[PDB]
Amino acid sequence: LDAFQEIPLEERFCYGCQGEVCAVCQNVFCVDCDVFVHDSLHSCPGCIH
């Protein structure tokens, strides 16, 4: 599973938990889900859709 990239301000509301980034599907992720997708689920929610 690939790693992810982040920048604070540019272009919050996350795609996963919908609480206030994948290089493939381009989906905003918060810190919590950024850790859960890597450490536990081993697949990206945006990559499934």
| Segment 2-7 long-range contacts (CB within 8 Å, at least 24 positions apart) | 3/38, 4/29, 4/34, 4/37, 4/38, 6/34
Site for other proteins in 1-49 (CB under 8 A): 16-19, 30, 32-33, 36-37, 40-43, 45, 48-49
Q: How far is the CB of 17 from other proteins (least distance, A)?
A: 4
Cα dihedral value 23, 16, 47, 5, nearest 10: 20
Q: How far is the CB of 1 from other proteins (least distance, A)?
A: 10
Please give the residue ranges that form the binding site for other proteins (CB under 8 A).
16-19, 30, 32-33, 36-37, 40-43, 45, 48-49
